[PDB]
Design a protein around this ligand. Structure first.
Ligand SMILES: [Zn+2]
Lengths: 131, 154, 342, 194, 134, 52
RNA sequence: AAACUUUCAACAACGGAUCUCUUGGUUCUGGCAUCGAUGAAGAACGCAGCGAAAUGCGAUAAGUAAUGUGAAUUGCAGAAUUCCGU
RNA sequence: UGAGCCCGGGUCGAACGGCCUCUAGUGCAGAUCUUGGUGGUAGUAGCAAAU
RNA sequence: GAGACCGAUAGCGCACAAGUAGAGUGAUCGAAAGAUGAAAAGCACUUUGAAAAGAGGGUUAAAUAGCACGUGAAAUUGUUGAAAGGGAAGCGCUUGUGACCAGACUUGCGCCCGGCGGAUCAUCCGGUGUUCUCACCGGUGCACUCCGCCGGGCUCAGGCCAG
């Protein structure tokens, strides 16, 4: 029994992002979603063949929210003391070393994570093996 | 994983650069694309013919309808011009690369234009504006394949 | 304008750039006129050209390299030390297995634990004749074997050296060479290199197959005692007498602590009328090889090696005594541009 | 004022809180049985509290906080050594945490269980790492990586490998390293050498 | 903490005052420590640098190097001491600038003024040491 | 400049909030929850004698 | 099949956004009261080795006297110019 | 769900981030918007003015 | 002397030659423009040729930091590579083909036997701090107890997808 905690199957209603209308045609419009406010916009009027709109019905199961495909919840660590906070939660959470953590501090985080039994999502970033 | 196609060894390639040259950018692009992938002695003789009005370069992308003649039959194009200054500036950079090859120890009869490229220069701050260009080119030797010997049984 | 910075003496941009353009135009015209005046003077009298060329010479880092004033850390020419004694014992004593004749070699190539560089490790195994590749782990959840265990295994089953190819971002990154030796002597030195620019033979334009013939070795530019250790270590891995019928050549050339590895297929052709004679070393043209060139075709991977550590046994865990490590690369021995450990 | 402390701790500020976006909050205080910030497991907002900790020497202790030694922060905790036998340590929790909230008893037993399990895991990792003989060293610094990328291009230019190989090959043709009647060269070119 | 109203704890004014100082004020800024023998001989912490002071460099890439000061370039806040030279492209050795805070004074160039300088420092160092003591 | 920078607070409310801040200082876990390293002092008000 | 056209990637350009910096501005507060016929504020002409800008100065002209400090100025050409010294 | 957020690879060189509160010159596709930069037109019109 | 102000399209028009350049008969109008590097160490020398340009070679930690100089976005452009194109492209749902890229459960505990070493084991002794009954040292040994360690044997436990 060395894995994530037993969870329900991970079901995602949608995998495609909600692209903003006319973001394909104009380079000044980002793909981040904006609600169209025109009274005759086909996306707002919900015609067929048009881009869908975000709604609360697309929301994910609460027992599966914020959960990685492995079944662990992401936990941003910055040092060794952040790893020891997952001593009681080694099967619910996984350690994510931050992008600002240096090379030698990642060594101490990786060594402590293996001892505590927590997963690391970024375990081969600035490190290499020596024989 | 995948590995990109490596560059030819610098002992086989000679480079030459021209930056901030006061020639039309569009005429240089059509002249450089005409001589791409050629032997150096072909390219030099061709450019002296464009100066002497004997041969013409094709206008494909930046093709203002200025010249149609029988000199387009060599390319299959209906648009062919005679850029004099574009040929003069490109000759001076091929002769620079041939000189760089000679100092490096290359075989000057077997150079080919492996790569040639024309980019836009900063616009000259004078309502009328010029269109200068950067030009880079790499001259490499022709590939030499040696004969493999028969495998030994053992 | 070689002694004054214009940015600190003129406080305005647009005045500074206007003066620097006027300086560049003036200096380019003044330089061109000087060389053209120098040309016709040298044409009318060719003697001052010969005087000028041997007094003006382009500087090189190789001619400016710092030596010390042989103990595996001493940056000293072993070749010059021998000539000065005429006007190495320490290396042979510390490493008696490497320095009578080596037997027929036999090479085992493995990767790191759970490697994904099998095609690259098979290309390293194809480099050395009588080399076999065995994957280290054999599936993801299997037994993790240590390099000490594999060294004992290959020693017992009659192998002569072990090569471990470490990986990073699914590219080969480190080459660990473990000398197993023979009979009762323990497993020998462990030389660890770093691979920086690996290019397979498939990606190389105008490439070729390698035949099954044994290549001759060209170990170039190896002068310090550490480099003679690296030259000798590569020599045991290759067979002593090369099969010269197949013209293949493995080249390990050192240029300022970078060992460039190439593999070619030569042909002794004549010279084309546009080709030049092969100007050899010391600036002078070579004698006896007039009009004769050696054509080359790259058949092997391009890779650059840089030696980082020499161990006494098999790795750090495997080297026991007070001299467990023999040479280590720190970045402080490259502070000066001109010092090369070689 | 145990509730009034909790309202300040929960809803104004607590220096031990770590708010994550994953639907749970964490307490960084070292004397907490669970890492989570809730009413049951906040040691500051519970005058009576218990916690299981592990010493650097390897000893596992049980800590006790009472309402009487509350104004004295240096004397907050009674430290009791827990047995190395797993069953006697579980019983030692039950006798010492008698008449406590059952949350504290149940989570101290879990904290005892995870501490012993990590210690066994710690000894199995160290035994395998000693056998494997492999350590994680940091990779190259970006300053050093830019340094040898710059000097490799200058060394590759200085090496001039193809001319160096050609010069060395024709040198060994002259000295007769290939012997009389060489297999490397055709006969009419070996005649040109002499 | 500052308490006097006539002193300003402003980064703008301080960097202005340092880089626009006249040559007399720049002299005090380019002051150097005395060596341990020289401290125990004259009871002086630090004096400004002259043109004839034998000095030892303790900071930078020219560490543990001794020499005599050749010039005091007060404009760029730097001094030139003997034999620490760097070759240009042409081979012309230009002197390398060292800050006076990166050196330590081994020998002084004494005259009447320098003795008066060092007597005034040991006057005040002893006067308050006596005042602190008794 | 005639934006209202200073605000008028009742003196009764100011004296209320000070007396509440006094009482919170006598409460032990509120000290270590603010950030103070209170793990060595032997009493939370921690009076020192005037003679010292 | 090339050319041309579209999309994407790598490298190379054009351009100066973003991040960081600030001998600048802006706003407040405090001590004090001082232009000119004894020629002001402003305008101009000159003065240096190379001075183009700016600054300083007035045929005693990048300055003289006196006082204080105590060994420079400096991008290049200075002196037998001065170092227990008006 | 989303506005958005975290990590890897490269570049890069000196400062920055989370929490809880306070504050505001705080979120852009439009305004024949302002300033800058850059296109097709187009190597076209035509060599007039300007350079 | 200061600031819960602005930080080079902002803040005075002006961080810099700024009431400057320049326009207007004149009254008046009035800009744009900061950042090499720690240090010019600002590329000596060889070599093409007429240049605000290259190829070598050197300086520097770094020159893809070379007075076009910190970082260097987008629009727009060139080369290389892949795919497509019978009078529009772009977009939504769903496959498929190819290319490149990633790597799935961290992959374990419990019994039995034998040896070895430790202790929280001896109504063993001495000491220290303390919340005054709890901890921590030092020296004893292995009758008992309990931990590890090594060498065997055994047990179950597990992640995803199918039938
Ligand atoms: Zn809490």
């Amino acid at each position: 029994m060395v894995a994530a905690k037993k969870h329900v199957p991970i079901v995602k209603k949608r995998t495609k992002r909600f692209m903003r209308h006319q973001s394909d045609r104009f380079k000044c419009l980002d793909s981040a979603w904006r609600k169209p406010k025109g009274i005759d916009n086909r996306v707002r009027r919900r015609f067929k063949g048009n881009l869908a709109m975000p709604s609360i019905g697309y929301g994910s199961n609460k027992k599966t929210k914020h959960m990685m495909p492995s079944g662990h919840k992401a936990f941003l660590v910055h040092n060794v003391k952040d790893v020891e906070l997952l001593l009681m939660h080694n099967r619910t959470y996984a350690a994510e070393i931050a992008h600002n953590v240096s090379s030698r501090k990642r060594i101490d985080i990786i060594t402590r994570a293996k001892q505590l039994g927590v997963k690391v999502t970024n375990a081969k970033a600035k490190v290499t093996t020596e024989v | 994983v995948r590995y990109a196609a490596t560059e030819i060894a610098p002992t086989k390639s000679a480079r030459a650069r021209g930056s901030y040259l006061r020639v039309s950018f569009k005429n240089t692009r059509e002249t450089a694309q005409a001589i791409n992938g050629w032997k150096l002695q072909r390219a030099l003789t061709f450019l002296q013919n464009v100066i002497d009005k004997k041969e013409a370069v094709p206008m494909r992308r930046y093709a203002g309808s200025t010249g149609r003649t029988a000199q387009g039959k060599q390319w299959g194009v209906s648009r062919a011009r005679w850029p004099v200054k574009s040929a003069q500036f490109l000759i001076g950079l091929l002769k620079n690369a041939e000189a760089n090859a000679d100092a490096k120890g290359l075989d000057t009869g077997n150079l080919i234009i492996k790569h040639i490229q024309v980019n836009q220069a900063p616009k000259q701050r004078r309502p009328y504006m010029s269109n200068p260009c950067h030009i880079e080119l790499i001259l490499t030797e022709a590939e030499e394949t040696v004969q493999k010997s028969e495998a030994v049984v053992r | 304008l070689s002694r004054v910075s214009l940015a600190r003496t003129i406080g305005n941009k647009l005045k500074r750039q206007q003066l620097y353009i006027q300086a560049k135009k003036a200096n380019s015209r003044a330089k061109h006129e000087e060389r053209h005046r120098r040309r016709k003077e040298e044409a009318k009298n060719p003697e001052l050209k010969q005087k000028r060329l041997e007094k003006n010479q382009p500087a090189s880092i190789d001619k400016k390299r710092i030596w010390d004033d042989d103990s595996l850390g001493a940056v000293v020419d072993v070749a010059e030390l021998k000539r000065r004694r005429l006007e190495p014992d320490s290396l042979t004593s510390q490493f008696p297995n490497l320095f009578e004749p080596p037997p027929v070699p036999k090479i085992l190539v493995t990767t790191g634990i759970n490697g994904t560089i099998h095609k690259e490790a098979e290309e390293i195994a194809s480099i050395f004749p009588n080399a076999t590749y065995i994957r280290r782990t054999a599936h993801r959840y299997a037994y993790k074997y240590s390099v000490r265990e594999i060294a004992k295994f290959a020693k017992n089953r009659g192998y002569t050296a072990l090569l471990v190819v470490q990986e990073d971002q699914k590219r080969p990154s480190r080459l660990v060479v473990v000398h197993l030796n023979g009979e009762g002597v323990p497993p020998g030195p462990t030389l660890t290199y770093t691979i920086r620019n690996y290019a397979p033979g498939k990606a190389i334009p105008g490439h070729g197959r390698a035949t099954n013939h044994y290549p001759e070795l060209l170990l170039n530019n190896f002068k310090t005692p550490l480099g003679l250790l690296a030259a000798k270590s590569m020599h045991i891995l290759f067979p002593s007498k090369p099969e010269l019928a197949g013209r293949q050549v493995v080249t390990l050339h050192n240029q300022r602590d970078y060992i460039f590895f190439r593999r070619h297929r030569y042909v002794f052709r004549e010279a084309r009328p546009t080709e030049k004679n092969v100007v050899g070393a010391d600036g002078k043209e070579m004698e006896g090889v007039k009009g004769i060139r050696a054509g080359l075709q790259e058949i092997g991977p391009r890779m650059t090696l840089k030696l980082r550590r020499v161990d006494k046994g098999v790795g750090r865990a495997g080297s026991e005594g007070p001299d467990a490590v023999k040479w280590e690369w720190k970045a402080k021995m490259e502070k000066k541009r001109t010092r090369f450990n070689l | 004022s145990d509730e009034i402390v909790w309202q300040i701790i929960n809803q104004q500020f607590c220096a031990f809180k770590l708010k994550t976006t994953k639907g749970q909050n964490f307490c960084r205080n070292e004397y907490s049985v669970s890492g989570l910030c809730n009413r049951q497991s906040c040691p500051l907002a519970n005058s009576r509290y218990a916690t299981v900790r592990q010493s650097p020497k390897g000893t596992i202790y049980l800590y006790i906080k009472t309402i009487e030694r509350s104004h004295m922060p240096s004397k907050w905790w009674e430290k009791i050594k827990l047995s190395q036998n797993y069953q006697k340590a579980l019983e030692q929790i039950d006798q010492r945490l008698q008449f406590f909230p059952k949350f504290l008893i149940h989570k101290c037993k879990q904290r005892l269980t995870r501490l012993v399990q990590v210690a066994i895991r710690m000894r199995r990792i160290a035994a395998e790492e000693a056998r494997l003989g492999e350590k994680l060293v940091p990779k190259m610094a970006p300053k050093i990586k830019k340094r040898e990328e710059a000097r490799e291009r200058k060394a590759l230019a200085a090496a001039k490998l193809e001319r160096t190989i050609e010069r060395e090959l024709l040198d060994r043709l002259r000295q007769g390293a290939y012997g009389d009647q060489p297999l490397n060269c055709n006969p009419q070119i070996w005649k040109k050498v002499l | 903490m500052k308490v006097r109203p006539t002193v300003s704890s402003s980064r703008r004014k301080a960097r202005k005052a340092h880089f626009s100082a006249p040559s007399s004020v720049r002299r005090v800024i380019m002051s150097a420590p005395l060596s341990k023998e020289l401290r125990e001989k004259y009871n002086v912490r630090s004096i400004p640098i002259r043109k004839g002071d034998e000095v030892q460099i303790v900071r930078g890439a020219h560490k543990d190097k001794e020499g005599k000061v050749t010039s005091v370039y007060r404009l760029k806040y730097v001094i030139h001491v003997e034999r620490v030279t760097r070759e240009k492209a042409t081979g012309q050795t230009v002197p390398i600038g060292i800050h006076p805070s990166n050196v330590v004074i081994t020998k002084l160039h004494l005259d009447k003024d320098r003795e008066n300088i060092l007597a005034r420092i040991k006057a005040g160092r002893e006067q308050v040491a006596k005042a602190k003591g008794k | 400049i005639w934006r209202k920078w200073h605000v008028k607070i009742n003196q009764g409310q100011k004296r209320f909030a000070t007396a509440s801040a006094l009482a919170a200082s006598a409460v032990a876990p509120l000290l270590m929850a603010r950030g103070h390293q209170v793990s060595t002092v032997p009493e939370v008000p921690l009076v020192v004698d005037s003679a010292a």
